[PDB]
């Protein structure tokens, strides 16, 4: 979810 993150 975060910028660089798939998260």
């Not at 979810?1 to 998260?7: F, I, M």
Request: charged share 15%.
């Amino acid at each position: 979810g975060l910028p660089p993150y798939v998260d």
